[PDB]
């Protein structure tokens, strides 16, 4: 499992309210989070499926 899959989700400083997915390693699950539209980190995916494919 890539190390970035352990990062906490990062909304960043933007003002958009975009639904994105992160891998929650403790939950063994991809979960939705709000991304502000800038300054993304790597644990940040378009869908649950893309999160799981990278990290599960």
Numbering used by the authors: 1001 to 1056
Paper lines:
We mutated the exposed and partially exposed residues (P8, K15, R17, R39, K41, R42, and D50) to alanines because we expected that these substitutions would minimally affect the densely packed interior of the native protein45. The mutants were named according to the numbers of alanines in their sequences (i.e. BPTI-19A stands for a BPTI variant containing 19 Alanines) and a suffix ‘a’ or ‘b’ was added to distinguish variants containing the same numbers of alanines at different sites45. To provide a structural view of this peculiar instance of enthalpy stabilization, we crystallized and solved the structures of six simplified BPTI variants containing 19, 20, 21, 22, 23, and 24 alanines. On the other hand, despite repeated trials, BPTI variants containing 25–27 alanines merely formed needle crystals, unsuitable for diffraction. All six variants crystallized under the same conditions, indicating a minimal disturbance of the surface properties, even upon multiple alanine substitutions. X-ray crystallographic analyses indicated that all of the simplified BPTI structures fully overlapped and that the main change that occurred upon the number of alanines was an increase in the solvent content in the asymmetric units. The new water molecules were recruited around the alanine substitution sites and were involved in novel hydration networks. Thus, favorable protein–water interactions appear to be the most likely factor responsible for the increased unfolding enthalpy of the simplified BPTIs, rather than the relaxation of atomic clashes or the creation of new intramolecular hydrogen bonds or van der Waals contacts, assuming that the hydration structures remain the same for all alanine mutants in their denatured states. Finally, it is noteworthy that a protein in which more than 40% of the residues are alanines can fold into a native-like, well packed structure that can be crystallized and solved at high resolution.
